[PDB]
Amino acid sequence: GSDRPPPYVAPPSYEGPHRTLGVPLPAGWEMAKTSSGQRYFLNHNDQTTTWQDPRQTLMNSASGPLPDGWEQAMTQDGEVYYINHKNKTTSWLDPR
């Protein structure tokens, strides 16, 4: 299949189980792991990293929610994706 580019690697299909985050991470944030598997967070908005769950950035207050009908979830490998229940789709792109 070298004549075609590598296939798109999609998020988990809409139908099936999802490890949803009850409260989504704020837009522009990412979760990662250290080499020993310690969880930490990246704020791409102000280009910082921190141990503290956003749910040097001051995060007192509630952040922008997903639009109605959407949820944030995480793959087994820790990759965040977005579930749109309105049209039964999933996407790597944050709709906020």
Numbering used by the authors: 134 to 188, 207 to 247
Sentences from the paper on this structure:
WW domains organize molecular assemblies by binding to short, proline rich peptide motifs each with ~4–6 residues. The type I WW domains bind to a consensus ‘PPxY’ motif (where P is proline, x is any amino acid and Y is tyrosine, also known as PY-motif) with very modest affinities (with Kd in the range of a few to a few tens of µM). To achieve this goal, we determined the high resolustion structures of 7 representative WW tandem/target complexes, and measured the binding constants of >100 WW domain tandems or isolated WW domains binding to known or previously unknown targets. In this study, we discovered that WW tandems, but not individual WW domains, can bind to target proteins with extremely high affinity and with very high sequence specificity.
We were able to obtain high diffraction quality crystals when the Dendrin PY23 sequence was fused to either the N- or C-termini of the YAP WW tandem. We solved the structures of these two versions of the complex. Although each WW domain engages the ‘PPxY’ motif following the canonical type I WW/target bindings, the overall structure of the YAP WW tandem/Dendrin PY23 complex differs substantially from those of the KIBRA/MAGI2 WW tandems in complex with the same ligand in two distinct aspects. First, the inter-domain linker of the YAP WW tandem is unstructured and there is no C-terminal helix following YAP WW2. Thus, the two WW domains of YAP do not form a supramodule due to very limited inter-domain contact. This is supported by the two versions of the complex structures solved, in which the inter-domain orientations are obviously different. Second, the Dendrin PY23 binds to the YAP WW tandem in a parallel orientation (i.e. PY2 binds to WW1 and PY3 binds to WW2), instead of the antiparallel binding orientation observed for the KIBRA/MAGI2 WW tandems. This is again likely attributed by the lack of inter-domain interactions between the two WW domains of YAP so that each domain can freely choose its more preferred PY-motif. In contrast, the coupling between WW1 and WW2 in YAP is minimal. Therefore, the target binding synergism between the two WW domains in the YAP tandem is also low. For example, the binding of YAP WW tandem to Dendrin PY23 is only a few tens tighter than the isolated WW domains, and this relatively low synergism likely originates from the very closely spaced PY-motifs of Dendrin PY23.
